[PDB]
Structure formats: structure tokens, C-alpha cells
Ligand binder design. Structure first.
Ligand SMILES: OC[C@H]1O[C@@](CO)(O[C@H]2O[C@H](CO)[C@@H](O)[C@H](O)[C@H]2O)[C@@H](O)[C@@H]1O
Ligand SMILES: [Ca+2]
Length: 556
């Protein structure tokens, strides 16, 4: 048999708000993305995942939806959306949209009705509960600061919100709400959408009785919210009522779940989701409070990857990504973003990204080597997660504003949201007005127009890697094997399929290193290298590596 298209596709994540503005209001829009499809097509992209594009008050930039069937005013009209669809099809590309059904905006008609009275027909579309002992129903904290329970004076009860107070959680325990959600998914699927990424898919099921979390659970509340007892019954129901009738690919953002539970979401035999976005790797150096960082080495990096890969087993499938809209920039996070090493290391990371087993997702800008942004004050962050950390750690005296800044400058998701750098015109060609979030000053040296024609740019290296992966089955669907989980200097692994074996070797040190191939293995050909002065000799049994050198080889 053949492997589904999604297992050998290369996806690109577009955060519309920061991709391309075409009417100078400072916010990216659909017309801007449509206008750039040739750029994505030329890069070699097969499919695009776009962040939320529905009507939203934007308290959380698309993730607080006020109407699942209208497009966000800032991005355009349904007509623009359809046009995007049509233009992607002409290029043989597929669109994956974001599905945010753990919560809705508090401006959605369902919630406006729900909060009116305890007897309103929409009361149970959400979670309403009496406070206890003079305060909230229980000790549940919110991802974005303070309590997860908000009191509504209209009825005297509190409603639940794992996220923003303007993002009340939807009540999956209510059949009528589930059916409405299924009918809303068909509305988009009927328009031809090829894939759906499920926002915080592991938190749909709530714990009966809402008992207080234990002190330990409070330490990692994100994990506790992924343990609802009806989760998989609900995901299986959604697959049977909806996905069974279409040929869309499903990808779940399993945030907060213990890795050992991931197979329940992706084992194809369970008929739940097709693939998984996990966070063990991207948060491998993040502390439990989600804002401090902890020092890690390449040994920790590869070991996490091996664990995640082993979790897909035979019937499951993983996505692979080094960056997205909720995390710091890939080259700053995992590579070395100092001027003299940024390009070499961004190419190294590209080699890792495109040779991993699973479906890779390239986050907008990483193909250029975009970096974290030089925040100077807390006022430079738009992110509500940061305002939340201020409320929970500074106002409470657990940390000073300076300590918060020092740390969130390295972890804030806003590092990934500064406008895409198209060229060196005003605001790097992202807008003719004022960008909603400041463009990085390094756009003068890091921009698409400058890299596109240069054979040695980070962009060209990504383009070349994508081509190589597309022509080498082993690099998408082949087996994966880490050659030395304990080595903290050089990442080396093999990918194999149908008797064909490839070797990937990436130096993660800003110093020369050597690599001896497994005994019995010899280089056969060199497919590509970055930052290398000369390819190895056919038959080489070892490799000399320059600082941050990466290479893909066919062995024998
Ligand atoms: O970004 C912060 C925070 O939210 C997570 C889910 O736990 O991600 C998804 O849902 C959020 C709320 O809907 C969005 O703000 C975010 O953009 C979306 O990916 C995690 O990434 C993280 O804990
Ligand atoms: Ca615009």
C-alpha cells in the first residue's frame, strides 16, 4: 500500500496576523497570504496550517471565537477565504485550519444566552457552579493568570475558563453542544478543508465534581486538565460522526498530557486523531511554571525525541516542529543566534527538522533564520500569558518585574509573532502602516528578498532540504534510530526504508568535532551538507565536522 499524503507532506504554519498585511492597518490578512502562495509553493510547501481565522474579539488573537461560521474581520471576508482555498488548489496545495473547541469567546451568542439565567436553554453549553466557602468553586488556576473561575453577577454563579476570562470552556458533557460542534466542523469540511489542527485537544473532558487539585497537581495543573474521564469517548464520537465521512487529516495539540498517553489519541486503530503535536521537545528546557528555563544539553534533546518517536509505534504518527506561535524562535531556542553562528545553526536545525520521522511543520520565518526579539520592557509584550505571569508572580511578590522580564524575554510566544520579514523596505515589507507588534530590527540583514536569490542563504538550504526529503521516501516514512542517545556534541541517526539507509549527522557545538560511523557502516554518497568545506570520501568510516556542520548521507 501507499502512505497517506499527510505522512510525506511538508507543512508550513502561517500565523496570519503576522504574515502579510495588504491594507496597512498593521495586521496580516487573507489577501496578504494569498498573494504569497507562490513564495510558499517555491519553497516546496505541500500544505499550510493557518492559526484561527474566525470572527473573534481577539483577546487571544483568534483563539477566542465569537462565531465559528464567519471569518475574522481583520483577515477579510468569506469571499477572501474561499479565494485562498481556490488559489491553494490551483497550486496543488492543501489547507489545514485551526479548530478551537475547548472554549469559545464570551461574546459568542451561546455564552450570552448561557449566562442569562440558570434556566436558559444554553446554560449547560458551559460550566456554571456555585462558589464554595466564600470564594471560587475550587482551586483551579488559569493558564493566563488568577483563578479559572469567574463570577457572573447576573446569576451569582461562577463559570470555568482554563484560559482567558474571555474564553469560557465549552461543556462537552452536554450532547446538544457536541452535536453543534460536529455540525460546525462539517460546515468547514464541506468547503473542502484538507486538515484540522485541534487546539488543546486533551482538555475537552472535565473531572466530575470538580474537586480541588492536590498541591502536587497544582504544580503541574496543565497535566491535571488532560485527565478528564470521558476524553477518548468524546474524540471517538467526533471521529465517527464527522471524520469518518471526509478524508481530512486530523492533528491534535496534545498540550499537557503525559507522553505515555499519546498513543490513545493517534493509534490509527482507535479511530481518534491521525497525528500528534507533542510538547515534550519544545518545552524540554522549560520549568513547571512555564516561564523559567532550565539548562539542557543535546543529550536531553535527542533522548526526548527518541521517546516521542517510540510513542508513535506502528500505528501512530507524529508531527515534528522546532517552533510555532506559542514558543520562542527555533534558532534562538535550540541553535545559536549570535551574528556569527545564526546562519550555520539555523541550517543545522533545518537538517534536523526535515529528516525527522513524522510530518514536519516549518513555522513562518524560520526558513529565513528569524530570531527572538530584543524586548526591553514588559510593555513591549502584547502577550496575555505574560500579563498573566505578572499577575501571578510579580504582584504576589514571588518575583520582581526584572526577574520576569529577564526570563520571559527568552520564552514569550511573542518572540514568534513579530512580523514576517519580507525585505528591507519599511517594517520589512510586512505593512505600509504600523505593525501591530514591532518588527525585529535585524530585518535589515534577515529578510526573504535578500535570501531568495542567494544559493548560500538559510532559505535556499531549507528549499534544497525539502526537495531532498520529497525525493527520498526513507526520510519521511522510514524507520528512525538514534546512534548514540548519550552523546551531547553530535546528533547522529539513521532513517531506513526498503533496504535504503541514510545517515544524518549534525554538530551542535560551535567547535570542530569528529564522528565515527557505526562499525560496518560506510558513506556511500553525500546528499547535502551545510557549513562543510568538503564532502567525505566514498567509503569513509568517520567524519570530521566543522562548527555547526550538518549533513545527510546515503550509507552502505
Ligand atoms: O499559549 C499558551 C498556552 O496555550 C496552549 C494550550 O495549553 O495553546 C493553544 O491554546 C491557547 C488558548 O486557546 C492559545 O492561546 C494558543 O495560541 C494555542 O496554541 C499552549 O501552547 C500553552 O500552554
Ligand atoms: Ca490588514
Amino acid at each position: 500500500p501507499g502512505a497517506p499524503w499527510w505522512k510525506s507532506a511538508v507543512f508550513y504554519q502561517v500565523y496570519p496576523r503576522s504574515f502579510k498585511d495588504t491594507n496597512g492597518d498593521g495586521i496580516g490578512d487573507f489577501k496578504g497570504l494569498t498573494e504569497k502562495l507562490d513564495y510558499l509553493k517555491g519553497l516546496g510547501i505541500d500544505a499550510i496550517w493557518i492559526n484561527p481565522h474566525y470572527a473573534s474579539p481577539n483577546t487571544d488573537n483568534g483563539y477566542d471565537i465569537s462565531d465559528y461560521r464567519e471569518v475574522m474581520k481583520e483577515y477579510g471576508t468569506m469571499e477572501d477565504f474561499d479565494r485562498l482555498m481556490a488559489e491553494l488548489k490551483k497550486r496543488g496545495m492543501r489547507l489545514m485550519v485551526d479548530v478551537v473547541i475547548n472554549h469559545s469567546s464570551d461574546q459568542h451568542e451561546w455564552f450570552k444566552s448561557s449566562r442569562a439565567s440558570k434556566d436558559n436553554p444554553y446554560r449547560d453549553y458551559y460550566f456554571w457552579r456555585d462558589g464554595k466557602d466564600g470564594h471560587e468553586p475550587n482551586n483551579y488556576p488559569s493558564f493566563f493568570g488568577g483563578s479559572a473561575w469567574e463570577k457572573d453577577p447576573v446569576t451569582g454563579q461562577y463559570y470555568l475558563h482554563y484560559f482567558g476570562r474571555q474564553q469560557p470552556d465549552l461543556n462537552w458533557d452536554t450532547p446538544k453542544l457536541r452535536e453543534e460542534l460536529y455540525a460546525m466542523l462539517r460546515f468547514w469540511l464541506d468547503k473542502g478543508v484538507s486538515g484540522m489542527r485541534f487546539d488543546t485537544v486533551a482538555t475537552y473532558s472535565k473531572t466530575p465534581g470538580f474537586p480541588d487539585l492536590t498541591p502536587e497537581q497544582m504544580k503541574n495543573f496543565a497535566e491535571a486538565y488532560t485527565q478528564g474521564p470521558n476524553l477518548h469517548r468524546y474524540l471517538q464520537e467526533m471521529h465517527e460522526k464527522v471524520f469518518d465521512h471526509y478524508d481530512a487529516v486530523t492533528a491534535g495539540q496534545i498540550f499537557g498530557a503525559p507522553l505515555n498517553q499519546v498513543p490513545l489519541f493517534i493509534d490509527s486503530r482507535r479511530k481518534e486523531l491521525d497525528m500528534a503535536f507533542t510538547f515534550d521537545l519544545i518545552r524540554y528546557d522549560r520549568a513547571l511554571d512555564r516561564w523559567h528555563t532550565i539548562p539542557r544539553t543535546l543529550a536531553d534533546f535527542r533522548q526526548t525525541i527518541d521517546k516521542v518517536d517510540a510513542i508513535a509505534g506502528e500505528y501512530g504518527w507524529n508531527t515534528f516542529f522546532l517552533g510555532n506561535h506559542d514558543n520562542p524562535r527555533a534558532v534562538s531556542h535550540f541553535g545559536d543566534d549570535r551574528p556569527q553562528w545564526r546562519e550555520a545553526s539555523a541550517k543545522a536545525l533545518a537538517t534536523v527538522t526535515l529528516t525527522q520521522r513524522g510530518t514536519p511543520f516549518i513555522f513562518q520565518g524560520d526558513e529565513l533564520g528569524m530570531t527572538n526579539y530584543p524586548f526591553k520592557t514588559l510593555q513591549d509584550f502584547d502577550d496575555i500569558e505574560v500579563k498573566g505571569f505578572f499577575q501571578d508572580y510579580v504582584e504576589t511578590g514571588k518575583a520582581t518585574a526584572e526577574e520576569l522580564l529577564t526570563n520571559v524575554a527568552l520564552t514569550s510566544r511573542d518572540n514568534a509573532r513579530t512580523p514576517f520579514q519580507w525585505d528591507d523596505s519599511a517594517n520589512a515589507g510586512f505593512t505600509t502602516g504600523k505593525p501591530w507588534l514591532k518588527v525585529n530590527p535585524n530585518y535589515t540583514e534577515i529578510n526573504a528578498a535578500r535570501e531568495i536569490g542567494d544559493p548560500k542563504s538559510v532559505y535556499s538550504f531549507y528549499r534544497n532540504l525539502i526537495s531532498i526529503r520529497h525525493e527520498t521516501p526513507a526520510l519521511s516514512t522510514g524507520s528512525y534510530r538514534d546512534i548514540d542517545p548519550s552523546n551531547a556534541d553530535v546528533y547522529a541517526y539513521t532513517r531506513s526504508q526498503d533496504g535504503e539507509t541514510y545517515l544524518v549527522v549534525v554538530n551542535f557545538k560551535a567547535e570542530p568535532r569528529s564522528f565515527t560511523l557505526p562499525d560496518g557502516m560506510h558513506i556511500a554518497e553525500t546528499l547535502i551538507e551545510s557549513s562543510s568545506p568538503a564532502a567525505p570520501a566514498a567509503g569513509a568510516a568517520s567524519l570530521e565536522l566543522q562548527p555547526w556542520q550538518s549533513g545527510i548521507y546515503k550509507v552502505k
